[PDB]
Every structure is written in structure tokens, then in C-alpha cells.
Nucleic acid binder design. Structure first.
Lengths: 787, 787
DNA sequence: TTTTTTGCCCGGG
DNA sequence: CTGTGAGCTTAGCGTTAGAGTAGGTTTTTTT
């Protein structure tokens, strides 16, 4: 029965599973795969805890369908991190049968067009983008299957409502062609009260189970007392350690199980709070070792390899990590460089680290199981802790093979107790659409996009079809205004020129501003703020410097950071007129910055909303300029107050926004603006090729400078030590694009001073000085390397 | 001796000469080829009257050397019309031997890279341009021969001094290398004085003849009395058909030779005076036949075919050609189209036209003999006629031995008789080099080109090698201020950033602006303006429309027309609000336009020297904007005060200026601005697409408005007659680049009106109405073709 | 109160 | 928005910011 070898897998995949793990399925998996019609081809929704073999029940369906029918699966995952991990995992299983597995995730994408793949594993908005493009190609018939994780995100508005739109399009196009399942939807979720509604919407079969291989003792600590689920008072605890201001004994709650050689995962409200607790915990591991209780075992021979591997990173070994990592204490949050996450994840996954204070980043996207989970408060960011967040936090408790029973302890004040009791006793709110109009309110951005994305694809081009599409949404299940809201959208789309009216009844056609908003996969709420920037550049584009191209290209964010408007006003005042003119043409204005330094965010009329959206995008441009200007990432974080983890997210985004907005300007037909961006797409790439890595040892070589030496002479630093200073000076003078020292007639001097100060090679040296000093540096580097 | 077959020509060329020419040389041709060292590879400078077989000597020397030395030869010719004719001759002559003959002239380029050619037939600046690039590619060793026509041109300031700069380079690059010739030079110089000096400068043989196949009977008329050049009276004239319509009775002097039934040619100081006087003469041939020496034999059947060929002209038959051409009278201007000029010449070349009136456009650039030449006055323009122009006029008398003698008649009133006679009794002034200076004067721009070009090409870079170059000039040869002239050049080229000074004498290197000058082959004095326009565009470029890029690629002229400043000032206010913004950024201003309306004469400081060039260029940009906007030339002429010759020169020059300024911008490193210009150069062309030609012809559709139909549905006229009006309406809506109809916030209402106007057609049709009308015209005219 | 003339790399079948 | 303990700093008791997350066509290969 449960032994997987009986299920008829091809031996290569069976042997790969035998290598990867258990040969026998859990009983719930055998039931769920033996519902009456899921194997026939009917859609499915199911739920199991994250500790269960959740994805196996999809993988065996994928393996069957892609082998039994020569059609292409589309595996939709909530985050790039889990998408990358699942890509490599699934590649390892199927590759010996010849299934081509590749993914759309972050900046990475398949080296071949979708028609060559067999299983595309991708993030949600990559999948919706691919669905839009499959519609534009009308090649949708290729799509065999959609596998959806976290289907309970149907109601999440920041991201997730895309899952309504995406599944609705597949239903509608199937129903449009209908009026043996063409596209099977397999939807994985946490258990919901109305899960059978989602299953009924998807016409799906249903399974859900409480089964988990490792059981969880949930609890709330209040005072000394620990209450089990159903508030059974199982235990009282007394402080094994006495610590100044550890009024909750949070260190002792760690130490108690550290005495048992078991690890602790400690979720906190914020990054600052994680650093403070990783500091405090490491100080007590130090004190216990210094005042030398049971002994503490560390295997520091391994921690020195981890901590040296951190020292190699251009971040440097962070001042907190210097203190904590030697003791097996770490911290983990999205302020860390991706490599620092992967190092600290790996060190905790092997258990070299024993305590890891973390934000929600270890709740979603990072599967670090632990014996004991702790949640430092019921309040997060002044919210009550979300019930979905809590039940995803505690799902980390228990380690499959290393441990027998999982433990979790919420820490709660006596006055807060009702909130903790609610978190344990409560259950997830019923999932409900974002399409639903609130009774008296303006129609929602999810509905506006949901209507635009069919019209622009040439699907449901007449309004009677739009009512037929609305009847496919999950909203049309949640209600059992449904007609009147649709014609309130087309008014908004018409009066913003996303679509055109045509008589005969009527037919609606996409404008270029339609096709651009669709095929760049921007949101309609963004392409107004982008178009008001792109079109205003057509009226006067500064070509002598990058800042205006960066303002068009820089990612849209709201509150990318807390912004110091006063330092931004001090910064804007300092800009060169070469660049301050770009601020004027963009519309940055002293009358607006003066308000934003003097007072609150302006009340948002459409004018004041636009003028606010301009400045936050400009501030993000000045950061993004400094990144390409090779200003030290240590300096940038002083200058703008962001931190190194945000910068890598900005680098990841700006490299993509250059690509989107090129397609946006292409679809508008503004080909003369496209080329000015399609060239800049070559320069938003921040990692050097190995060509310069030797030359980059020379302190006077910016990569922009090493670029011309290697292009001119293939130089090894030995060659730069051999080179004649006169040849370097001429190579330097033939490196920079020509910019006069001459003042032209009716110029202001500041506009040419900034042409002169832009040619000195650091302010900085003149080339006659630099070309001597760089040969003297190179010959010193050479003799230091040869010894 | 003189029988050509004895000279050892290859039979293919010999038979081609037997076909095209005659089997014998003239006496002077043999005597010159028998100059002992010439056939050994000595340089030669020779003269023969232009009606003799001047070029046969040069052609025979090329043919021999390319067979024997087997090195590539460069044939330099004064004008593109002369170059094209001599290209087809040399190609048709040599190609049966397999000599790869092609050339560089006008917008033309050879079908393969230079090294593929055996002969390059070339205009002066395509040759001096080529010589610069052979030095950059260091292929100078390839150049085995240079052959030069009109070597007397060295004294022109506007042009042709390049023929000193080129030959001085070849001399210097020989003598510096050497201290059987490295290059053989053959120069033709039309019987100058000081011709021994030119021969001595090139270290060449001197050869001269006055031989003519038919003698020139010069004469001069005052009153009724005609005098020989010796001022003997030859005749008193009898003005048959006496009329007050010509107070000098030149109509009778034309009719006289017309009674001899031979062609006559008349040179006139002005287009309108030419155009008037052709009408006057034609109405007397009308008067003869309407009254009826015999009447003029008209052969009207051929003239009606010629006149129908003018009716077939895209610009239609000129009403003045309706008057004159049926009588065998025509006129000839730079103001005609080039097609009309070629047609009218050909009709005269076949002798169908028997009288032709011209400006100097028949002095130089073409050779069409006429038995009698008439010169209307000793005064041409505001000044006495140049004796060089007189000789090239009267040289037209020899009808290729189809007639036994040639005639010339200078005509004047009783005043200035001596200054008239001085054209007959005078001879060419001494040739000289415009590299010469006054003491109270700047070093001339032709010297600045010389001493710049050596530096930038990477030759003679040392401060003493330039004085070694100057010793090879024809200036220095003529002198056997000049020592300071080279130092004045280097100071001027430093202050204009064309060169860089490096220490340890000193060694000078090109800037990018140096190499950009030479690579574009612009003048230094032009490049100060073409750069300042580009440098100003970098500070704020209007991508919104075509006008601001046209201002950069607008051909730069002095007085390409008189500018009717009041009509231009009216045409300035009529510019749309976006185009009136371009006028701000380039610096067009009412405070200058109104001042040119107020008064023609202005003083000029450096500000005013730029301001004139800005406006004179901008006015020419407006003409280009209309020409790409498909405005009818019938309007443009009347709108700007322009004619169909000036327009045609501006089209043919603009296609080259967008070429040069790509290569100018590319090598300044402004690769963003380069790609805009390189993109726009793909639009700045005026040919007709093969497949669209009939579609644009029949339906009266603008080229892009038809092209998108062929792109969107491949319609022929027979298919557009079937097109659905709603489908065409949707195409008409989405064919254009997106211009939003909505006003933005923070925008002038007078600005958005433009963007909504741009989508209208012309009148002022809606897209609905145009999409109806276009289908009606297609389906109606389909029937008119089928009937 | 007014004459004629020239420059550039690159693609095509 | 909501909240609270962290933050500022000389001292020893003043004053508040605060989670994580993502979209593009061409292109893959070197001096």
C-alpha cells in the first residue's frame, strides 16, 4: 500500500526518491491521491501542515500527468527563495527521465522559450505574466496543469489576488472554449473554514487533515505559568537564570532546552529587537562559560570556518556576529545580505548555531525547523499578531528526523493574556476576494485590473462577455452589484484611455497604453504614475548624464525606507546643476520639499498625490545613482539611512524595471525613448566579470577605470607595473567621453565647472598625476605579490 | 607613331577605344607620353585646351601602371557630375580586362570595401577624406597612383585647396619615409602661368600645348561693330528681325547661327535674366512661323516627346517650358530639378533643342559643345566676370569635329569696352596657395586644416615634424609670417581643444574632438558650430518630435536662400507649442528675429556670430521638417521663398549630414546621442518603396499611412477596395505612436491641444470618416482601372 | 540688385 | 491606524520606529 514502489513510478524517479528519503507515504497521502476523480483529472484542493509531506501529493500528480499526457505543467510558488529550492529539487528527480525543468524567478529565467520546457516552476507574478503572454500568443492550449501553493492567499491584497485573476482566466478560457479536464488545478493551502467553498469554486475534490509526523505542544506562557491548548495548566516555570531585565525569563526559556542540547527559534517584532536578544543571549552563554550548571558544547572548530566565511564577504563580519557566532548564537532578518542569510541558514540547519532570533523572514520562504519555537510578543508592529502568521511561525516547531516532539511557547503579559488565548483558540478568517466592492465605495483596483487583463488579451471584447467573465471569479462564489461594478470599471478604463469605445451594442479595444500595461505586467495603478513620468520626459530629456534615465527606470516603491526628508532637502540643494536641472524637469520643487521637511505627508488631492509620488521616486533615484557610481555601500547607508539588505532588493528590482519600462516604451511606439533605455539596461548590472578582478586590486582603479586598461592592454598588474606612465596617461585621456573645459557663449560657469570637475580622476587627480601614481601603485602591488 | 595600336594596349581596351574614340592620338598626346621619365614613373604636370583629348594621357598612364606596378590608383575629379560620367566611362572601358573600377562621389559608395577596388574614381573631398582614413588604417602603402584634374583650383578658398593638402600629404609621407616613385602624380592645369612652379613643386615634368581640334574665333561687339581679339573690325552686324525686345539685337545673333541650322549657347548673369531672355527669343521663332532666311525647322514631334517627358515629371511641366521648348529654346538653372536639367541637356545633346540659355551651370560640371557661345555682359552679378569663367565658357565652341570651327561673341555696350576686351586679351592669373597670410591677419583655415590633419591622423606628431611638413607645401615652394603660422595654428588648435599637448620639443595628440573632425571630414571652423549645437542639445533634448533632431542634422549653409525674416517671424509664431519649445532650447528668440525684421545689417561679436548661425540653421530646419512631413513642394516654394532646385540640394545634403554627425558623435563617445541620430538617419531619406509605389500613387495616401496598411493587411488597391471600414478605423487609431487625448495635471491647456490635434487627419477628418472615405476611393478607382 | 558647388558608415540579392 | 519599549548618553533615567515581498526580451560564447 504505502510503499511507494508499488505505485508504478519509473525506477529512476523511485531510486531518486529512495535516495532523497522515506520509501513509504503517510496514510493521508494515499487517501488524498485515491479520491475518486483527482487521478481521472478533476481539479483538487487539499490541506496539510507544512511539516507533512505536502508537496509530494502534487509532485506525483505532475509526474503522472506530464508522462501520461505530453502537455506542460506550470508550478506556482509564493516566493523566489522557495521557487529556486523547488526548481533544483524537482530537476534532480525528473531529469533522468528527460523532463526539462526551469523557472521564472527574480532575475533568473529559462535560457529557452516556454515551448521548450516541460515543467515551469515560477513565482505568482511570473506565472500571471506567462499566462498573459500565452493568451497573446494564443498558445494557451499548451498549458496542461497549474499547481498552486498557499491558495489561501486568494484574499491577500498586497500580493495574492493575482491568484484570483490567474485561475479565473484559465477557467474562463476553458469555459469560453467549452461553451478530460483541459487544465487541472491542484491547490495547496492551510486549512480554512470555507475551504469547501474554494474547492467548489474550482469544481475540485477536497481533502484536509490534521496529521503531522511530529506533534506540537502549543502553549502560552503567562507569568510563571504555562497553559496548554484548551488552557490546561500543564506547567509552571521558575527562572533557571537571573538576568537584569529578563522579566519574561526569555533567556532561561532558551537555556532550559540548551541544557538539553536543543535549539531555539525566537521570533521578534523587529530587526532591532532580534539584534538585542541575540546580543543578550550570547552574553549569558559567555557568562555561563566565563563564570564556570551543565556544560555548553559548541564544536567551535566548525564555527571558526563559518565565521571566517563571513569575514570573506564584502559586508565584513558584522559587529554583532563577531560577538554572537562564536557562542553558536546568531540572528537572521532581511537586513542581511543574501549570502549572510544563506550562511546563517546553513549554520543553523547543521545546528552549529543554536539560537536564531529572527523576524517573520523565517516564517515564510525559509524552512528552518527547530525543536522549540518562541514568539516574543503577541503584538507585532502595533498590530495583533495575525492568526495566519502565528500558525506559520509555530509550524517550524519539531525536526522530522532529529526530534520526537515539537515544542512552542508564546510569551505573553498578564494583561495581554486574552490576545494569546485568542491566537491559540482562534482559526483563520474565511478567505474572501479582493474583487468585492465595498457597498458604498469606489470599485477596487483588483477588479479594474481583472477586467483590463482580458480586454487587452483580445478575450471577452464585448461587455456581455465581461459579465460572463465576472461570473467565473471566486467573488461570484463568495456572494452565494455583481453586474453594475463591471460597467463602473470600463468607465474608469475609458476615462483614463486604457481602452477605446467602438460602436457595434459596443466593442472595446485596447490602446497602446492598454497593451503596455498588460505586457509589461505593471499594475494599472502604477502605469499612471509611470506614464506621467515617461511622457513628461519626452518634453525634455537630459542626455548628458544618467540621472534622468535612472528616474525613468528606478523602481516604484512606497516607503522603500523611512525617508529623512530634511537630509533629502540638504542633498538636493547640493546637487550639481548638471543634475539639479533634471530635478527641475522631473518636477522636484523647493515648495514641496519645504513642506515635507516642515510637516506631515500632504493631504492627497490628485495633484498632491502625483507630486508626492515624484519625490519618493527621485529619492530612490539618487540612491540608485550612487550604486552605479561605485560609491561604497558602507557610505551609501550613511548617506540615505537604508541598509545593505534593502540595497540588494533595489539592485534586484532596478535591473528588472529597466526591462519592463523598455517594453512599456516599445508598446507605446516611443521607439526613440526605448533606445535611450535599452542601452541603459546594459549598465544596470552591478557584478563584475573576472576580467578585472586582478586589476581591481589597484586602489586607483574603479571598475570603470580597470575596464579601459583591460580593454586597451589586457594588462595583468605586472603589465601595469611595466607600462610607461605616458601610455597610461594617453589611455586615460582616450578613455573618458569628450567633455569640454571650454566655456561656450552664454553658458553659466557652473555648467562648465561641473564638466571640468567631472573629468578629474579621484575632486581628484589630473591624469598626469594619476598615470604616475597608478604605475607606482602597480609596481608596489607586483613586488608585494611576488614575495 | 600616332596609330594607337603601336603602343601595346591590350586588345580589349584597344577595341573599346576603337569603339568609343578614334584609332590615333593627337600630336601633343604622343609628344607628352614620350617624355622619357614619365613612362618610367616620373610625376607629370601638363596642360592642354579642354577640347583636346586631355584625359587620354592620364587614362593611358593609369592603365599601364595598374598592369605593371599592380597597385591601386585614385582618380580625383572636380564635381560629382564629372565624377559619375568619368566613372561610367572608366568602368565601361577597363572592365573587359577585369579592372575593378568604382568610386566615391556624392551619396554613392562602392559595393565593397576600399581594398576591393583597383581604380577609385573620386571627388576632391571623398579623396582627401579617403587619404585621411588610409593613414588611420596605415594602408597608405596601397596607393600606387594619384591622378588629378583641374589642378589650377589650388587658389579657391571655399573648396579645392584640399587638392594642395592631399598632394602635400602624399609628398611628405613619401619624403619622410624615403629621406619608381612611391606614388605617381599626374596633374592637369589648363595652361596656367607659373605652371613650371607647380611642376617643380611636385618634382614633375612640365608639358604644355595650345593644340585644339578646332580653333576658337573669339570676338567682341560694341554697338553694331564686332571686333577680333586683335581689335580689328571683322564685321558690322546686320540685325535681321530687328526688334526693341533686344536693344543689342542678340536675338539676331542667335537667329543668324540658327539660319546656319547649328546650335547656339548663351550665358546669362542671372536665373531670371536667363529665364526672361529664353522667352524673348522663343516668341521670335513664333513670330517667324506665324508670319510665314527660312523659318526655324522645329521637328516638333521630337520636341513634343521631350515636352511630354517634362509633363511626366513628378513636379510637372514648367509653363515657361511650354512657351519655349516647342520652338527649340530652353533655359538652365541651379533652380531646376536635376531631372529637368538632365532632360534638357540630353535634348540639346541630340540637337533637338537648338538654343539654350544658362547661368555658369554650363561653364563647369558638364560638356555640351555649341557652335556659337554668347556672353551677355562683361559684368556677372555685382562684379566683373572672372577670366577663369570666361575661358571655360568660350571653350564650349568645339563640336567634337562634327563642325570645323567654333565661334564666340562677347557683347557689351559702348562703355567698358576695354574691360570687355580684357576678357579676350587677358590670360589666367598666377596660381597661388591660400595657405598664405597677411601679417595683420590670422592664419587661414586651410592651413589650420593642414596642420590639424597631420596631428590627428598620427603623423608628424612632433613639433619639428610640422615644419618639415610645411616645407613640402606649395606655399613654401612658391616662396622659393611663415615660421609663426605653424605656431599660431598649434595655439589656435589648443584653445579650441582639437589637440592635446604632452611634454617630452613636445608631442601633440588628437582629442576625440580632433578625431571626430577628421572622421566626419567637417571643417574645423564648422565643427565649432556643429559641436556647440550638440553640446547645447545634451542639456535638454526634445524627444517629443522630429524638429530638434533635424536641427542637429540640418545642413549648414551660408545664404542657401535669402531669408524673408518677416515671413519667418510669422512662421515662428505659427509653430505648435512643442515646436516653440524646441525654438527655446536651440536659442531662437524674438529679440533676434524681430531685429532681423527691423534691419538687415548687424554687427557681430561672438554672441552674434552664434545667433546668426542658430537662426539661419533653424530656418533651414523648418524646411526639412515640411519636406519629411510630405507638405506639397508647390506650397513649400511659396511658403519659404524657395525653389525646386534649392529644395533638391537640401534633401541630397541632409541625407549626408545625418551620416557625418553620427560619426562625429560616435567618436566623441556620446553613444546615446549617436543612436538617436543613427536611428533618425533611417527616416531622413526620400525614395519610394517598390511594393508601396502604386498603393501610395493611386489611393492618395501618405507613405506611412499607406505603409501601415501594407504592414497590417498587405492590401493592394484591389484589396483596399475590399477592406472593412471598422477594421481600417481600428488600424488608423492604433497605427500611430500613442498620444494621449487627456490633459495631465500641471500642464498648459494650449499644450494638450497639440497632442489631440496630432491624431486628426489634415478637412480635420475623424478616424471614422477617414476610414469610410478611404475605402470609397479605393473601390471606385478600382473600377476606373478595370474599365 | 545676385552665380554653382561638396563632406558620412553601412545594407542589399 | 493600530503600539510599546526601546533610546539617548553625562548622568541613570528620556523618548518612539516598527516585517517581508515581486514584475522584463533577449539570450546562452572569448580576447
Amino acid at each position: 500500500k504505502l510503499l511507494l514502489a508499488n505505485w508504478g513510478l519509473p525506477k529512476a524517479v523511485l531510486e531518486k526518491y529512495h535516495s532523497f528519503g522515506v520509501k513509504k507515504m503517510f496514510e493521508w497521502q494515499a487517501e488524498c491521491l485515491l479520491l475518486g476523480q483527482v487521478l481521472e483529472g478533476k481539479n483538487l484542493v487539499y490541506s496539510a501542515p507544512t511539516s507533512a509531506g505536502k508537496t509530494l501529493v502534487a509532485e506525483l500528480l505532475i509526474l503522472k500527468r506530464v508522462l501520461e499526457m505530453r502537455k506542460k505543467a506550470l508550478f506556482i510558488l509564493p516566493f523566489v527563495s522557495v521557487a529556486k529550492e523547488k526548481k533544483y529539487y524537482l530537476q534532480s528527480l525528473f531529469q533522468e527521465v528527460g523532463i526539462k525543468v526551469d523557472g521564472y524567478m527574480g532575475s533568473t529565467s529559462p535560457s529557452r522559450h516556454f515551448s521548450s520546457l516541460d515543467i515551469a516552476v515560477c513565482t505568482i507574478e511570473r506565472a500571471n505574466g506567462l499566462i498573459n503572454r500565452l493568451i497573446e500568443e494564443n498558445k494557451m492550449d499548451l498549458l496542461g496543469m497549474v499547481v498552486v501553493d498557499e491558495l489561501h492567499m486568494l484574499g491577500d491584497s498586497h500580493r495574492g489576488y493575482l491568484l484570483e485573476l490567474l485561475l479565473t482566466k484559465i477557467c474562463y478560457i476553458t469555459r469560453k472554449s467549452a461553451s478530460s479536464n483541459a487544465v487541472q488545478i491542484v491547490g495547496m493551502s492551510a486549512t480554512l473554514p470555507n475551504l469547501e467553498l474554494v474547492a467548489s469554486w474550482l469544481n475540485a475534490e477536497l481533502y484536509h487533515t490534521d496529521f503531522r509526523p511530529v506533534p506540537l505542544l502549543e502553549s502560552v506562557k503567562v507569568g510563571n505559568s504555562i497553559y496548554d491548548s484548551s488552557m490546561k495548566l500543564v506547567r509552571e516555570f521558575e527562572p533557571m537564570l537571573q538576568v537584569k531585565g529578563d522579566e519574561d525569563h526569555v533567556v532561561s526559556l532558551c537555556y532550559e532546552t540548551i541544557c538539553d542540547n536543543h535549539s531555539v527559534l525566537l521570533f521578534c517584532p523587529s530587526k532591532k529587537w532580534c539584534e538585542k536578544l541575540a546580543d543578550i543571549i550570547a552574553r549569558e552563554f559567555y557568562n555561563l562559560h566565563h563564570q564556570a550548571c551543565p556544560p555548553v558544547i559548541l564544536e567551535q572548530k566548525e564555527l571558526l570556518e563559518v565565521m571566517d566565511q563571513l569575514r570573506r564577504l564584502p559586508s565584513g563580519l558584522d559587529s554583532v556576529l563577531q560577538k554572537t557566532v562564536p557562542w553558536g548564537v546568531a540572528f537572521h532578518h532581511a537586513g542581511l545580505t543574501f549570502e549572510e542569510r544563506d550562511i546563517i541558514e546553513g549554520a543553523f540547519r547543521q545546528g552549529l548555531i543554536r539560537v536564531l532570533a529572527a523576524t517573520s523572514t523565517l516564517s515564510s520562504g525559509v524552512n528552518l525547523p527547530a525543536r522549540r519555537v518562541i514568539i516574543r510578543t503577541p503584538i507585532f508592529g502595533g498590530r495583533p499578531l495575525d492568526i495566519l502568521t502565528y500558525k506559520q511561525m509555530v509550524g517550524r516547531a519539531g525536526r522530522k528526523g532529529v526530534d520526537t516532539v515539537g515544542e512552542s511557547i508564546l510569551i505573553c503579559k498578564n494583561s495581554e493574556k486574552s490576545k494569546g488565548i485568542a491566537l491559540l483558540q482562534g482559526s483563520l478568517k474565511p478567505v474572501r476576494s479582493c474583487l468585492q466592492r465595498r457597498e458604498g465605495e469606489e470599485v477596487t483596483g483588483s477588479m479594474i485590473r481583472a477586467i483590463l487583463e482580458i480586454i487587452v488579451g483580445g478575450v471577452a471584447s464585448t461587455s456581455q462577455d465581461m459579465h460572463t467573465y465576472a461570473a467565473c471569479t471566486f467573488l461570484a462564489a463568495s456572494m452565494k452589484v455583481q453586474l453594475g461594478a463591471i460597467e463602473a470599471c470600463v468607465m474608469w478604463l475609458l476615462e483614463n484611455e486604457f481602452i477605446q469605445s467602438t460602436e457595434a451594442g459596443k466593442v472595446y479595444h485596447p490602446t497602446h497604453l492598454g497593451s503596455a500595461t498588460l505586457s509589461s505586467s505593471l499594475s494599472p495603478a502604477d502605469t499612471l504614475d509611470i506614464f506621467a513620468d515617461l511622457q513628461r520626459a519626452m518634453k525634455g530629456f537630459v542626455l548628458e548624464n544618467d540621472l534622468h534615465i535612472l528616474y525613468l527606470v528606478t523602481p516604484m516603491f512606497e516607503d522603500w525606507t523611512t525617508i529623512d526628508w530634511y537630509r533629502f532637502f540638504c542633498l538636493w540643494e547640493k546637487l550639481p546643476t548638471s543634475m539639479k536641472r533634471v530635478a527641475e524637469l522631473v518636477g522636484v520643487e523647493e515648495g514641496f520639499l519645504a513642506r515635507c521637511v516642515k510637516g506631515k505627508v500632504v493631504a492627497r488631492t490628485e495633484r498632491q498625490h502625483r507630486q508626492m509620488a515624484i519625490h519618493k521616486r527621485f529619492f530612490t533615484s539618487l540612491v540608485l545613482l550612487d550604486l552605479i557610481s561605485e560609491v561604497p555601500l558602507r557610505e551609501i547607508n550613511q548617506k540615505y539611512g537604508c541598509n545593505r539588505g534593502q540595497i540588494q532588493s533595489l539592485q534586484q528590482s532596478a535591473a528588472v524595471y529597466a526591462g519592463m519600462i523598455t517594453v512599456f516604451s516599445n508598446r507605446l511606439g516611443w521607439h526613440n525613448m526605448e533606445l535611450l533605455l535599452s542601452q541603459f539596461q546594459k549598465r544596470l548590472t552591478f557584478g563584475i566579470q573576472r576580467e578585472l578582478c586582478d586589476l581591481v586590486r589597484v586602489s586607483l582603479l574603479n571598475a570603470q577605470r580597470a575596464r579601459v586598461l583591460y580593454a586597451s592592454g589586457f594588462h595583468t598588474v605586472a603589465d601595469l607595473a611595466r607600462a610607461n606612465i605616458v601610455e597610461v596617461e594617453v589611455i586615460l585621456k582616450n578613455a573618458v567621453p569628450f567633455k569640454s573645459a571650454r566655456k561656450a557663449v552664454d553658458e553659466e560657469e557652473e555648467a562648465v565647472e561641473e564638466r571640468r570637475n567631472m573629468r578629474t580622476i579621484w575632486k581628484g587627480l589630473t591624469e598626469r598625476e594619476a598615470a604616475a601614481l597608478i604605475v607606482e601603485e602597480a609596481r608596489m602591488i607586483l613586488q608585494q605579490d611576488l614575495v
